[PDB]
Symmetry: D2
Subunit: 225 residues, 4 copies
């Protein structure tokens, strides 16, 4: 089949394991406590400028200037603020998004996620490796949202369900762009080369699951005992 779809098939048991894990399950039935959600926000904000830096590192890896335009736009979007799914999470805790992130966290998981992406952008000439590393989302985020709407255990009464509504639609653009690039780039690559890329993708897929478990566990570096 097509390469990006080969990725999606391998990613199934993980999105499955992410869906049945504690973050998603708890978001689903409305019972998720504002402490876990605080950890998730502070970290996302903390790694913000890293994501910005990765798109810019993608630019010299490009060829078509149409793809460069898009990377500018994604860099543009993040600096331009306006995080909608974040204010829905800000609602559930009941404090503003900006006030929560005045404190920041750099947990061992986010650190592991960020350096996985950076290793690809520093060590690997072909863009597909960086791109495969940043792709597992919002692909994962979208697929979770769609499993939500069909699911009858979904709690629609609370403000947890407005999170799922966001990722069902608004992630779908950049998924296609990443899908185009990866599929286009894989045409000339060998089977051995492509197995690496897939591994890059699936490691990132785990990093998402670990990122949610990080939020739930209030994870940090323990240097003091």
């Amino acid at each position: 089949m097509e390469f990006s779809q080969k990725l999606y098939q391998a990613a199934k048991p993980i999105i499955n394991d992410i869906y049945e894990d504690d973050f998603i399950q708890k978001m689903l039935l409305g019972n998720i406590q504002a402490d876990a959600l605080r950890h998730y926000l502070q970290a996302d904000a903390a790694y913000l400028k890293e994501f910005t830096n990765l798109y810019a590192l993608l630019i010299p890896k490009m060829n078509s200037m149409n793809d460069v335009k898009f990377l500018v736009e994604q860099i543009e979007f993040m600096v331009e603020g306006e995080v909608l799914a974040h204010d829905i999470l800000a609602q559930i805790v009941g404090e503003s998004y900006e006030e929560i992130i005045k404190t920041k966290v750099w947990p061992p998981s986010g650190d592991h996620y960020i350096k996985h992406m950076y290793f690809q952008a520093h060590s690997r000439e072909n863009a597909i490796y960086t791109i495969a590393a940043m792709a597992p989302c919002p692909y994962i985020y979208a697929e979770l949202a769609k499993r939500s709407q069909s699911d009858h255990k979904l709690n629609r009464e609370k403000d947890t369900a407005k999170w799922f509504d966001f990722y069902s639609t608004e992630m779908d653009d950049i998924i296609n762009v990443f899908e185009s690039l990866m599929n286009k780039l894989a045409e000339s690559m060998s089977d051995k080369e492509l197995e690496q890329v897939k591994q890059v993708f699936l490691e990132s897929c785990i990093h998402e699951r670990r990122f949610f478990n990080m939020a739930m566990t209030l994870e940090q570096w323990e240097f003091g005992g």
Copy 2:
């Protein structure tokens, strides 16, 4: 004086030699040949993708987000593809700009300039070294155009003068941005480091002279001995 003013000071003897070299001189009188203008644009257009790359690499070196927005504009400006001074040089040869750059050339002088800038981007952590490599591009051009306005040898009947009129104004805004970045970053640096930075800036000055001269001499790699 401010650190960047010491840089301008040092640059004067070179900026002078450039002004007195055949390119600008033959640009002043308006007698310059479509030969050299063709070579000039072709080299410059082949290096278009490379300058887009350099503004991208500077982003992860930027600690201030207003600095990042600036670098973003320069990429957008390069993606939009509006080159005013180039369309001016095109009509003098009498072909459209797209026809001329359909053929590209990649001369030694230009190779050395590019590789100099990439060396900073690639191996130097501090954004001051790359910027200092890039700065003598909009400064020198503005300075020559400003000299030509008070010069009685400037032939105002010829269309070559429109080129000068463009560079006496349109470069001013980006210079000051490079000027503020350089001056800001030099504050925390040892005097010896600044001796390196100054060296980097001065080589670029030299490459500008060499680039112009390459167009006059229709320079290229001769591998055929």
Copy 3:
């Protein structure tokens, strides 16, 4: 004090947590399972090529040619074997070393360690970060093994105590080298920068603990 001692002082709680984790405690008593030694040997041999690359990447960052002569020797060392601590460990499983490492393993824990190191080699001009990131390795192994020599729990009637005897001694030259380097580089640096270097150091300390813990827990990527 010197900067490197400041690093050693902060590394203490972590080193203690490592000593009281399962790997060292079971290494002391002799009763450590062969599953874990197996995973430890394979994860360590899979990451060998990476450690080669990191010393190599430190060379352009050096100035002195004596520092270079050192980095060269460590790679010349790594080529050859002289894996005597590992030669000892393979006797405990009862398979030969070469037979064990025929299948390499590539655990998430190691992955995070390696990439943390590489990050320094790739993104930081000054060598001190990449050195800070690799320094916990000899220093931690040394300390734990020094501790074992004053510790009555250690079973000298099992072959596992030969591990500690090796690491009580044979790391000491490379620790001094590293110690010189960090101390000399720190002189010219601000307090803020050294706050980052210390953080890089302590993370590898943590990575060291997770490396051990991973052999114990047979850690791997579960894609299925």
Copy 4:
């Protein structure tokens, strides 16, 4: 024919020009003077460390450990000193090597060459780009020195002949290693990629021609006018 021979055959007209240029000719007759020799020795020493760094950066791009054992050996040889050709040259300037290189110079021609090799080392994942950039150096010297043995203008009464006698032999091992690495690595590559590798190699041949020239002309960065 094997890939490296395609390279060797293309290098011929550039090697012939280098042979006919002033440095080698004056080396031949023995009338080359201390000025140019000193400048050659100074530039060469000044770039040692850099050529040393490059071997190191080939390591992470290496597949097997025997290629690494070689690279280590190269760095091991540069650390230990023992420059036989350089001592032959120092005798002619009538001084000691260590005295001559106490003063160092980094001329434009040298700078361009160095930045050419580093560009390959920083931006190109595949080892073949960096090796092809470094391969012309030993190879050219070998070819030059072998040609002198059949040349009756070779002045056997001056120690300049010992300079050729050395390069006629002592470069062969490393040439052969590089030849094996380039052949092996080329097998997996498209013809289009190989055209770029050939371009790097030939660019390095030209740089060799300019390095000798820079020495005869006492080249330096001219910032003063």
